[PDB]
Design a protein around this ligand. Structure first.
Ligand SMILES: O=S(=O)(c1cccc2cnccc12)N1CCCNCC1
Lengths: 350, 18
């Protein structure tokens, strides 16, 4: 066999320890899932500094403590117009219930007459997208460091019956230690069986999202394949001028690789970007272990990644607190709070 | 090359959800 007695015993114990950890993690999550947190601050506790992204996310500073945060501002009337009510309430509910080193932490939340506010920790290193486009492509060890954190995060989320559905470099931030933070849960859904919603980003959609058939958590493992491909190649495996042409390529599944990709990497990606759900890694009898035990991850110490004891390959430049130099610039619209309360009934639970 | 096709696709910037 591939493992002698010692290595076999070690791997089996590690995999049982994961089960033990996830059982406790799920009990913790479900407690907060059932009894959420609300209205833990108000607007005038913060000074607005700068727009980090676009509703809109702004760097703010806590007046009392001087701590910096990223505050997401949603216009209640806009969310209603876009039929986003359920999406927004669910994002807040998820963020206040989960807990994992690579998931952004919601520190405060509140609402006023016009807006909903989610105040999260400030992740100063900017988006992965920025650094990927800046250096072109990541070397395989670099790409693997990020990928391992996504694998652990999806293992955690999937144990809670959460499907993520929004993976892409634009939605992954780099923290001051060089580790990844996942932030956007507007498309996540808690569902045990199949679901059908057409949502996500074209380059990252699994075939079974595109096609009318139902799908399950395995779409996230397809999206991991897309992410790892894009990190290591510098462009995604399926693209074209228009989303319709992208979907046609995805459903064909004919994937080609750069000549510098290792054989281990191509083998992993062929098993993740697998159109046949009966064969896709992450969807088989052995679950996530088919991925974590793949040769491309042989040098990955999963506990050490989780414990954040691995040296990161890239450490963002931080010129002090409140430095936004790793983010793009956006036009600054003033925050307006109406005399009159808007859509109060629809957003009671926030 | 594949990269040049990617540049020519116009989808090299930030991508929006559908
Ligand atoms: O960078 S954000 O503004 C952002 C969001 C949430 C928490 C954040 C924490 N720190 C910086 C930026 C943050 N962003 C919004 C658009 C979607 N892609 C990446 C997340």
């Amino acid at each position: 066999g591939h493992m002698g007695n010692a290595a076999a015993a070690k791997k089996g114990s590690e995999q049982e320890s994961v089960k033990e950890f996830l059982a406790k993690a799920k009990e913790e999550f479900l407690k907060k899932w059932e009894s959420p947190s609300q209205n833990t601050a108000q607007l005038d506790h913060f000074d607005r500094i700068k727009t980090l992204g676009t509703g809109r996310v702004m760097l703010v500073k806590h007046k009392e403590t001087g701590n910096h945060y990223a505050m997401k501002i949603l216009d209640k009337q806009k969310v209603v117009k876009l039929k986003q009510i359920e999406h927004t309430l669910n994002e807040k509910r998820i963020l206040q219930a989960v807990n994992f080193p690579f998931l952004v932490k919601l520190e405060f939340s509140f609402k006023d007459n016009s807006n909903l506010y989610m105040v999260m920790e400030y992740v100063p290193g900017g988006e992965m997208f920025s650094h990927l486009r800046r250096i072109g492509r990541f070397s395989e060890p670099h790409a693997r460091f990020y990928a391992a954190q996504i694998v652990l995060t999806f293992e955690y989320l999937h144990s809670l019956d959460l499907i993520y559905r929004d993976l892409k470099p634009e939605n992954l931030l780099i923290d001051q230690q060089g580790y990844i933070q996942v932030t956007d849960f507007g498309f996540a859904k808690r569902v045990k069986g199949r679901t059908w919603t057409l949502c996500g980003t074209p380059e990252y959609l699994a075939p079974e999202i595109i096609l009318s058939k139902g799908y399950n958590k395995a779409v996230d493992w397809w999206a991991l394949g897309v992410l790892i491909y894009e990190m290591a190649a510098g462009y995604p495996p399926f693209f074209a001028d228009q989303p319709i042409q992208i979907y046609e390529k995805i459903v064909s599944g004919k994937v080609r690789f750069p000549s510098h990709f290792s054989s281990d990497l191509k083998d992993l990606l062929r098993n993740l970007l697998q159109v046949d759900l009966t064969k896709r890694f992450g969807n088989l009898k052995n679950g996530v272990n088919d991925i974590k035990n793949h040769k491309w991850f042989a040098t990955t110490d999963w506990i050490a990644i989780y414990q954040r004891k691995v040296e990161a390959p890239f450490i963002p430049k931080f010129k002090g607190p409140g430095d936004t130099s790793n983010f793009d610039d956006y036009e600054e619209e003033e925050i307006r709070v109406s005399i009159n309360e808007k859509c109060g009934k629809e957003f009671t639970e926030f | 090359t594949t990269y040049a096709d990617f540049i020519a696709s116009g989808r090299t910037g930030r991508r929006n959800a559908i």
